[PDB]
């Protein structure tokens, strides 16, 4: 009924998704992660639809969060109150993902179970 969860909250950023990244108007869901779980790395996950197939793509959580910040900031007065709480979450979730964040939490290939 409420938030429907995903089997794999973790993922690994491959150096092929930049070439085969889905455009904005094809993303179904934007499932994020937590600074404590999923090895504490800033990582997001997008879902798509390629011929009745739910395509999952690993995505940098830093760039994707800043993208949505610009989308809500572009709305200004036309932004809803729940949209301001979305901006509220991304504001502290970014400053919490940036703290620490050395080369250890930048290795996304930890969750690359192939």
């Amino acid at each position: 009924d409420g938030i429907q969860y995903v089997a794999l909250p973790c993922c690994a950023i491959q150096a092929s998704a930049a070439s085969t990244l889905p455009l904005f108007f094809a993303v179904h869901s934007i499932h994020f992660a937590d600074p404590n779980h999923c090895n504490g790395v800033c990582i997001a996950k997008l879902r798509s639809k390629t011929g009745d197939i739910t395509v999952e793509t690993c995505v940098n959580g830093f760039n994707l969060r800043s993208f949505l910040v610009a989308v809500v900031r572009r709305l200004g007065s036309w932004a809803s109150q729940e949209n301001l709480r979305l901006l509220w979450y991304l504001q502290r979730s970014l400053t919490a993902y940036t703290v620490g964040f050395n080369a250890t939490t930048a290795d996304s290939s930890i969750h690359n179970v192939n």
Partner: peptide, 23 residues
């Protein structure tokens, strides 16, 4: 269950899964 196409090690890895655990 739903067929999902995830990419791991720069190669596509298909999978069936379901995570409807709150109903």
């Amino acid at each position: 269950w739903d067929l999902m196409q995830n990419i791991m090690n720069d190669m596509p890895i298909y999978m069936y899964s379901v995570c409807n655990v709150m109903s």
